[PDB]
Write a protein that binds this ligand. Sequence first.
Ligand SMILES: [K+]
Ligand SMILES: [K+]
Ligand SMILES: [K+]
Ligand SMILES: [K+]
Ligand SMILES: [K+]
Ligand SMILES: [K+]
Ligand SMILES: [K+]
Ligand SMILES: [K+]
Ligand SMILES: [K+]
Ligand SMILES: [K+]
Ligand SMILES: [K+]
Ligand SMILES: [Mg+2]
Ligand SMILES: [Mg+2]
Ligand SMILES: [Mg+2]
Length: 1319
Amino acid sequence: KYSIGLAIGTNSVGWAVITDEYKVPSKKFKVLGNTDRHSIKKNLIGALLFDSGETAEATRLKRTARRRYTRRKNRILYLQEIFSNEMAKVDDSFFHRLEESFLVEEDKKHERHPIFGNIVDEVAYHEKYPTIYHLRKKLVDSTDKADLRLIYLALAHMIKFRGHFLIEGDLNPDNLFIQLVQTYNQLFEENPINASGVDAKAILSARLSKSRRLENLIAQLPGEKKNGLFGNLIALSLGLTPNFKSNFDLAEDAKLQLSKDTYDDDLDNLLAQIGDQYADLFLAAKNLSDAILLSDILRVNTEITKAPLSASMIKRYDEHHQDLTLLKALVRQQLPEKYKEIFFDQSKNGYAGYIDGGASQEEFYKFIKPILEKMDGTEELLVKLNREDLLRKQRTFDNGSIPHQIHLGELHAILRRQEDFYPFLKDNREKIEKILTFRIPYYVGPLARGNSRFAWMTRKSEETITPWNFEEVVDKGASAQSFIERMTNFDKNLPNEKVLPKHSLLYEYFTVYNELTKVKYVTEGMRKPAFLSGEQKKAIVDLLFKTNRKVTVKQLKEDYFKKIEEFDSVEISGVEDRFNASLGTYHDLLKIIKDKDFLDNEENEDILEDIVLTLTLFEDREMIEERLKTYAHLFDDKVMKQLKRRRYTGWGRLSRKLINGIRDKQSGKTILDFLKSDGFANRNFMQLIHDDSLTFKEDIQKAQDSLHEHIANLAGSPAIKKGILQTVKVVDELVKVMGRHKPENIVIEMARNSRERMKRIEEGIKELGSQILKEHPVENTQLQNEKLYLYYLQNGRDMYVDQELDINRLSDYDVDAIVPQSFLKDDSIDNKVLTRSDKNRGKSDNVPSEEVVKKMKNYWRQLLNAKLITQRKFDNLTKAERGGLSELDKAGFIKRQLVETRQITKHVAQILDSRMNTKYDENDKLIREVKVITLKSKLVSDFRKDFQFYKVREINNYHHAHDAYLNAVVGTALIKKYPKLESEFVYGKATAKYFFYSNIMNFFKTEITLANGEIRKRPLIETNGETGEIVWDKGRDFATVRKVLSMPQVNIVKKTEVQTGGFSKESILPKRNSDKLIARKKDWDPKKYGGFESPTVAYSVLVVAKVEKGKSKKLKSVKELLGITIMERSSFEKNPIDFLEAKGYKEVKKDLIIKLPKYSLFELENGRKRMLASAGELQKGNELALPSKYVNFLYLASHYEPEDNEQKQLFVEQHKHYLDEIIEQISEFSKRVILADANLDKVLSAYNKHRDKPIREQAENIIHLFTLTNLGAPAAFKYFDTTIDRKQYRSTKEVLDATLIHQSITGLYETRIDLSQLG
RNA sequence: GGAAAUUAGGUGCGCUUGGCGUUUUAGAGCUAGAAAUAGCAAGUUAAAAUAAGGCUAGUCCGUUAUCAACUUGAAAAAGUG
DNA sequence: CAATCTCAGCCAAGCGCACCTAATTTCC
DNA sequence: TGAGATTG
Ligand SMILES: [K+]
Ligand SMILES: [K+]
Ligand SMILES: [K+]
Ligand SMILES: [K+]
Ligand SMILES: [K+]
Ligand SMILES: [K+]
Ligand SMILES: [K+]
Ligand SMILES: [K+]
Ligand SMILES: [K+]
Ligand SMILES: [K+]
Ligand SMILES: [K+]
Ligand SMILES: [Mg+2]
Ligand SMILES: [Mg+2]
Ligand SMILES: [Mg+2]
C-alpha cells in the first residue's frame, strides 16, 4: 500500500512515494557496472530536472527565411537566363565575375573588376555613378542606348530588393488642396475657409509628427480649430484616423481611414447618416491623398524625373557630400585635435566608425551632436540631426516603407527606354516585370512535389512552376480550398460534415432562433409566463431582427408587444438588455443586393449559402469573383462588384446537415424547424439532440494517437507539456519499483513583455489623442516597472479620483487590487490600478464602491476604448453598480483557490487515470483502482507556513521533491478525512459553502482562531466520522513529515540530453589565422574569408585510441573526450571509425566508445560530482543538503517584515549562532566538492565585513551565497555589494579516470563505470 | 462534467512577404621618405553568402518534439534490478 | 597554467485554422 | 552560459 505525490513544473518533476503512515520508504537497489559497489540504499523521493522545452516558432521563422533566400536567388537566376544569350555577345564572362565576386583575387578565375573586367572602365563607372541609384535614375530618364551590363545591374538591383506588398493595386507617382478648400467652401457655403498663401506641400510633408503638422496647418487657417470638421479631415488625407462624432452631432462613434478596406463601407455608413451631399468633401480628401501618399519616401518633384525614388537617394547622397565637406572644414577650423577621432578612429562612434566601424546612424548622431552644439556654423547640421536626416546613407533601416510599385515604376521605365535597342527586352518586358511583382499566395504554400510535410498545393499540369506559368500550372482554386479545409473543424455531432461558415445565413438563423425560443413573457392577467409561439417568433424575426442589426429588449417591448400584442406593460425573461444573436449577414447582403424579397425567398437558400461560403473560403477578390459568376445573371454588375468585396472570416461549430438537414423521423422536421416552432415546449438545440422521443440523438450516435502524440496535441505551452510526458514516465518507473503494484492515490499539482508594453501604450495614447508620451518619454525597458507601466496605461491619472498623478511621486502611490486579493489570486495588470491612496477605493471588503464607479465610469470607458484596460478589467471596476460581490461570488472565489480548474491539469489527471484504471465491473462501469487527486499550490503552500515546513528555493533543488511529498501527504489525508470531497478533487447557504471551504484545512491544527474571533479545540487524533480509520495524529504524523524533509539523500537527476539546433553562433567574424573559425561554404577558407565561431557540441564521445606525435608521427595511446558538433553528428553516426580516423585517431577501441551527452554525471573523490557542460567544460554535480533547522532559520530571519511574530522573532535572536554555522556548512561543502578557494576566500572575507549589518540583511545575502554551491553551471553572485564572479571548470580531463554514473529517470537505478580501468 | 451564442483577452501550428546587419571582393588613394613613418585626400555604392549542405532534384528539404545503461534484435521494438 | 575580459542576429508586414480563460444568456 | 581571446 502506497501513494505517489507529483509536482509538475516547467523545468522539474518532483516525486515521492508514501505509505499509509505518511512515511517515505527506502530500498536497496542493485548497482550495475564494473565497480566495487553492488547495491545502494535510496529514499523513494526525488526530482527530475530538465532544460525547458521549446516551441516550434524559432524553427518556423528560420524555415521561412531559407525559402526566401532560395526564391530571391531564383529571381536573379530567372533574370540572368533571360539575358543569357544576348549577354554572351557583349561579355561572355560578366555573369561569371558576378558569381565569384566574393573570392580573393588568387581564387578568382576571371579579372577582379566585376562590371567591365578592367580597371580603367571600372574606375570610370563609379566616378560617373557613385551609387546604384545614379545608374537607375540615368537609365530611366536618358534616351541613349545603354551598355547591356549596366541595364542588367539596374534591373537586378530592383528585383533583388523589390519593396513590400502591403498596398494593393497600381501606384503612379504624381505630385488640389485649393480645390478641397474650394470644395469645403461650397458644401459649407456659409462657412468658407481661405487657404490663400498656405504652402500645403511644405506643411504636410514635413518630417515632424502628424499631430504637430495638423497644428501647423490649422495655424494657417484662422477661425478653424484642429478638432473642427476640416481639421479632422486633414488627418484623413494625411493617413491618420480621427472621430467625426461631434462634427456631425452624432450619437455613435464613427472614424474613417483611407488605407483600410472598409473605407467605402464606413463612408457609406457615415454618408447614409449625414447626407450624400458630403460626398465631394471626402472625394476631394481622397484626390489630395493620391499626390501626397509617397511624400515620406518620394522627396523629389515628379515632373522633373520619372524615377523620384532614385532621385531621392541621390538627394541623400548630394546632401551627404555637401554636409561632409562642411563638417570637415568646421572641425579642422575649430577643433583640429579631434579630427583624427572623428574621421579616422573606427573604434569610436565618429564618422569613421559610422562608415567603416560598427556605429549605427543612431549611435553616430549621439556621438556627434555635442560636437556640433559646441561649434559655430552648425545651424543647419543640428536641424538635420534632430530630424534624423544628417549624413544619411542610402541602404538604411527605414527603407521598409518603400512599396514594390515604386521599384516597379523605375523597372518598367528602364525597359521602355532600352527595349527600343534590344529586341529581347521588348519580347521579355512583361516577363521581367513579372519576376519583380510575382508573389506566391500564402494560401498556396510551398511549391512542392511530394517531399514537403508542410505543403498542400496541387498542380493542373505536371511541369516546373515559374512566375509566368503559375496561374496555368498551379490549381489555385483547389489549393486555396485545401488550405482552409485541412484546418477547419468537422461537426463533432456529424463527424463527416464540415462546419458552416460563422457568417452563414442559416447559421445565424440557428443562433437567433435558439436564443429566441427560450424567451418567456408575462403580462397582467396571464397566470404564468409563456413561451413565444411559432407565429410570434416569426413575427419578431420579420419585424425586428430583419429590420435592425441588433434587437434590444426595449424594442421587443415597444415595437412588438405594444404595437402587435397591444401590451402596455410586459416582463421579459431569457434575454437581458439586448439579444446576443443577430442576423448580421442578412443586413450585410441587404445593403449590397438591395432586394429584401430575394433574401426572404427560401428558394434562394442554396444560392445564398454558397455565396457566403465563397466569401468565407477565399480571400482573393478575383478568385471570389470567378467563383461567384455562376450567379452573375441574378444581380446587377454594380451589385456583383460590391458582393466580391464583402469578405468574411471564421467558421461555426455546427454543420448545415445538423441544424437543417437531418429530420426527426415521426415529425419530418429539422432542428431549425423545431427552433422555429415546437408547440408549447420550445425545445432548444441541447434539448432536441438529447430527447429520446426524437430521432436526432440516435442519428448523432450512429454518426460517431499514441501517448506522445496525445500530449503533443494538447493546448498549452510546449514547456509545460515536456513535464507532462516526463511525469508519466516517472510514474511508470515508480510502479515498477513497487513490484508492479499500483498506488492507492496519485496526487498531482501543476505550477502556475517589454516589447508589447511599449506597443499597447503607443496605440492606446494615440487613441486618446493624449500628449503624455511627448511630455514624459520612455523606453521599452522602463515599462517593466509595474507602477510606471500603470501610470501610462491610465494616461497619468488616478483610477479612483479624477485627478492627474505626479510621475515623480510614484513611490508614494498605491497599487490596489480591483477584486481584493484575499478573494482572488490575480496579481496581473488586469486586476491592478495605480491610485494616490488605496483608501479612496471605498471599503476593503468589496469591489470599488458605487460612488467611485459613478465618478470614474466615463473615464474608465475611454481607457477601455483605447485598449488601455481590458473588458474583464472594466467589468471588475464597475461591478458595484451590479450589486458588487455577492455572497455566492465570495464562495466561488475561495472554492477556486482549492479546486484546480485548468483544462491542461485535467488532461494530466485524465491521462494518469486512464493508464492506471483499465478494468470494468459487472455493469461495465470503470473500476477506479487508483484515485487521481489534483491539488492547487496554495494548499501545500499554506500547509508549509502554518506548520513551519519552510521552503528556500535558492538552497538546493530538494524543494521540488519536498513539494511532491507534501502533495501526497495533504492530498491523501484530505480525501481520507472528507471522502465526500472526492467529486471535487478526484478525477472521474452560500455563506455555508464559503465557511466550509474556508476551514477545510482546519482538521490539521490543534488550536484554531477563526475569523469570527473564537477558539476551537480538536483532539490529537483526527479520524473519519463514518469509519473508524484514523487519518491524522497531530503528535507522530508531523514528526514523520519533519523526518522526511530532513533526509539528506534525495534523488535529484538532471536529465541528460543531446544538444540540437543551430550549428554554431550565427555571427560572421572577419578572417583570422586561427583554426577555430568554421567555413561558410565548402571552399571558403576562413583564413581568407572569415566564418562562424563557437560550434555547438551535440554530445561527447569517449575515445581510447592512438594519435601520431612529432615529425616522426610515432603512435601514442590516449584517452580523450571528443566533442561531436551538431554539424558533424550525421557524419560521425554514419561511420564512427572513419570519422575518428579522419580526426587523427588510430586503432580506436570501437567497443570502448561511450556516448556522453550534456549533463553526463561523474563522481570523483570525497563524493565530489561533476556534470558535462560540453567536451571541454564541467558543471557542479552536487547538492548541498543543508539541515532543516538552518533552512527554517533562513526563512524566518530573511522574512522579518499575528502578534505571534514576537515568538518567531525571539527564536531568531536565540539562534543567531546559526549564521556562522551556515557559513561553515557552505565552507566545508565548498572545500569538499566546489574547489573554488579564490571565490570562497572572497566569500568568507565579505561575510566578516558585514557581521555588523542587521541580522535580516545578513540572512538575505547568505541566500545569495548558495549560488556558489548550487547544482549546475557556475554563475556570478553578490554578497551585499561585493560581486563574486563565477569559477568555470573549463577542463574535462579529470572525469576520464573518474566514475561515470548512468541514471534511470528516477535516479533509483544506477550503472556505475570506473573509467580508470580504461586505457 | 459538458453544448451553443455573446463580449474580451491570450496561446499554438502553418504559410507568404519587406528592411537592415555581417562577411570577402570591387570602387587606381596622393605627396615626402631607403625605410620606420608623417602630412593630406577619401568615405554614402555594388556583387555574393546568410545555417555546412542533402536527394527525393522540388522555385523541395535542413535549428521543434522525442533520448540513462544493458540485453535480444540492422531497424522498429521488447525485456532486465 | 590561472584569472579576467569579451561575446552572443535583428527589426517589420499580412493571412489561415485550431485551442485556452472569463464574464453573460440558455440548455444537456 | 559555453567558449574565444587577452592578461597575469
Ligand atoms: K587569379
Ligand atoms: K487656427
Ligand atoms: K561595418
Ligand atoms: K557602421
Ligand atoms: K549596407
Ligand atoms: K445580452
Ligand atoms: K475570406
Ligand atoms: K447581370
Ligand atoms: K531537442
Ligand atoms: K534546446
Ligand atoms: K537519465
Ligand atoms: Mg531578405
Ligand atoms: Mg542556400
Ligand atoms: Mg545589404
